[PDB]
Design a protein around this nucleic acid. Sequence first.
DNA 1: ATCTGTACATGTACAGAT
DNA 2: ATCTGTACATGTACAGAT
DNA 3: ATCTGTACATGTACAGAT
DNA 4: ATCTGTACATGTACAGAT
Lengths: 340, 352
Amino acid sequence: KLKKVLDKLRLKRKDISEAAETVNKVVERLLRRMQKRESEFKGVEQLNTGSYYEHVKISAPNEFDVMFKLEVPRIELQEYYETGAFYLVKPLSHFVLSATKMLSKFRKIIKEEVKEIKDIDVSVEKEKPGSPAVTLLIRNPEEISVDIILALESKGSWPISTKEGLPIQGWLGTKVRTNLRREPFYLVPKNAQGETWRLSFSHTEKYILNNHGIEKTCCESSGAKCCRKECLKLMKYLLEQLKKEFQELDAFCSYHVKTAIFHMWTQDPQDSQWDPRNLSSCFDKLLAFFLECLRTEKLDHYFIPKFNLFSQELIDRKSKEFLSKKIEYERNNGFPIFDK
Amino acid sequence: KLKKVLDKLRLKRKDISEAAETVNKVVERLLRRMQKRESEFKGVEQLNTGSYYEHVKISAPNEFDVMFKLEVPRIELQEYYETGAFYLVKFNPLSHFLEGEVLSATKMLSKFRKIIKEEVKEIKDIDVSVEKEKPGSPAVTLLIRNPEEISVDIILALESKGSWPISTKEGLPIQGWLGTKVRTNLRREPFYLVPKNAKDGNSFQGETWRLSFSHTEKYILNNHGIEKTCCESSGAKCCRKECLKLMKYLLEQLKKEFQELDAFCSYHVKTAIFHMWTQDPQDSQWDPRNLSSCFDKLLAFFLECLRTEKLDHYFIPKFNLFSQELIDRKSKEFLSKKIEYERNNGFPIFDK
DNA sequence: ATCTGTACATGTACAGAT
DNA sequence: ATCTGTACATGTACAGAT
DNA sequence: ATCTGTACATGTACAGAT
DNA sequence: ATCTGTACATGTACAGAT
Ligand SMILES: Nc1nc2c(ncn2[C@@H]2O[C@H](COP(=O)(O)CP(=O)(O)OP(=O)(O)O)[C@@H](O)[C@H]2OP(=O)(O)OC[C@H]2O[C@@H](n3cnc4c(N)ncnc43)[C@H](O)[C@@H]2O)c(=O)[nH]1
Ligand SMILES: Nc1nc2c(ncn2[C@@H]2O[C@H](COP(=O)(O)CP(=O)(O)OP(=O)(O)O)[C@@H](O)[C@H]2OP(=O)(O)OC[C@H]2O[C@@H](n3cnc4c(N)ncnc43)[C@H](O)[C@@H]2O)c(=O)[nH]1
Ligand SMILES: [Mg+2]
Ligand SMILES: [Mg+2]
Ligand SMILES: [Mg+2]
Ligand SMILES: [Zn+2]
Ligand SMILES: [Zn+2]
């Protein structure tokens, strides 16, 4: 079934162990260098985010996301247009706090430190505009990416654009939501302008992934297992496979699928609506939801409701119809792409 | 119905507001006086516990429980004869209470009590005295006349941040109800020790402390569902707390009429219902529409505890609150007859 | 001048009041 | 159904201390 | 302030039971 | 084939020591 696919996607203990040991060496070293120097990033703290740390990494342990976040007292935001997600922001003297200038110095430091590593085969990938990350390419056994993500940490209440976000009230509840919104919020230097930062809720997304049930015992050793994470794996795999074959899908990414499933988990809050016995129905209903997002050109950021990830401005109508045909096809033919 | 009883039991906002305003003044003042330097209790922090703070206080807001707890870093416990709940404490602002390396409960309580009495004398704004010391209490109890009687128990507590004592390893069996993450997190919170302060005449009388988990009990009362939305504004209401109120009321009413029941206390009913909440973890087994069944099944459980002389501390499984050594079988049979009677005759005592 | 333990400012769940 | 007082958790301002 | 030790949740691998 | 129990591996929060 889709069970055999999940078997293939399942990471191996051996591989996890080998990847993690190399990754931690490099990260531990980068993190130390940010402290030890008369460095403007002294104080930066490490936060592990994304799939591997959410336990929804598929295929291989080869992509790791780490936040190097820095406490910045009493900063003042100004929303960059009515975009909801992008802001100007107001030790760091030489960086309005310019995202690009801060990222550059951060990146310079990392590059320098990477040169000094003689026990691991590791380089710094050429910069992509649009990435807030300094990406490391590690080879030692085989290929592993590590994104080192610079983040400002603010302790204020979250910005107004998120007031109506995180609609978990009927699923995870009001106490969970109030507590989550008492955690700090993050600003990440995302930039295709050079002074614009972007809100990040990776920390919150991680908590949700690991506390995802309406029952406190969902997926615990004295609870019942659900198939919420397995659906997310399957959906991510369908996208990766399609994306590797079709250049038309360059504008799509796994965050789109993650956002979609957060909305489905809200819409279907009950653990019994994600029974492992109903993996197919569950996967199928997720596809149907994703297709509706494509058809209506609408997939709101889960934390920032006015920010449409499927706006015309971000992803072209044709790209959306293209992905629809390809999903509808896979869906109506037993997912041939799951075999390749 | 039982609904009409709960109507009577429901506290009133007016009463809550008047009681709370006076109580907080007194407590805030006592807490400040503890913080004056060359007080052995400098550092003590306030923790509100018990019914009122659990929202299961019934009838009137006239009893408040407050913990004045003090962090004591380097701590060695010694269990008092395999009892599970009682300990000597060992190893400084506390210098004067030490007998060799042993922290004297009674000496510490006495000084605490002396301070409080002194501070209470200086309050001319509120009518408040210190109740005569009751054997077995870790508390300095304040009697306030707000033209209404209000008790405040100020409970002296040691706070240890270490892992909880081994006697609790098998306690707090919430795994199938609240879950493993909740349990792990709760067990990462500190544990508390309060003076046992018995007047029996047994060895180590004045140096024996007792474990308290009031802080944990509070969290459970306010996060009591298998669903995170139990009793929230986008969830379904349960009758878990309402059963606890009803059971508490049946005991209070009986206790106020019968001296035979002096050995019984509300903690017995609280412990019983914690076991029932574990046994029946699903929110749907505490549907408000099934209040009678729910109340009835709790009574039946409590009666079985009385008949078999067994009600294990929820946190300390080997400590039987209904042992022969604590409460007489005759006392237990007496309470059984009275409950069985109320149960089989429309609860006439709810009408008094 | 800088630092800080204390108290205030802000936000919301719970439950009672309307 | 909507409104409201209390309790509680977290952030931040500041007179008195250094 | 940084570091380590402890405890346990979330995983995977595999054998015996169903 | 699926479930259950055990073993083995990693991540992560926090307390006590330095
Ligand atoms: N993390 C993240 N990615 C986002 C966001 N908005 C769009 N994206 C893009 O979606 C993809 C997801 O990348 P990740 O690997 O981080 C997500 P995962 O849960 O680990 O899942 P898989 O590893 O299984 O896929 C990427 O293509 C994102 O493109 P990008 O935004 O340029 O990401 C570049 C890298 O920088 C980090 N990063 C990006 N956005 C953020 C963010 N908001 N907060 C923190 N880190 C971020 C990350 O390492 C990424 O790989 C979005 O909000 N978050
Ligand atoms: N809390 C508590 N009480 C216990 C315990 N073992 C016996 N008791 C006695 O039961 C009664 C319940 O006292 P509370 O008022 O704290 C319980 P509530 O949920 O607030 O319910 P109501 O206020 O609606 O009744 C008391 O009579 C206890 O008597 P005690 O134990 O001799 O102590 C007298 C007072 O001291 C405080 N106190 C008692 N035990 C503790 C404790 N373990 N931790 C902290 N404070 C405690 C309390 O103020 C009591 O009134 C037991 O384990 N817990
Ligand atoms: Mg990733
Ligand atoms: Mg990544
Ligand atoms: Mg009391
Ligand atoms: Zn689950
Ligand atoms: Zn409830």
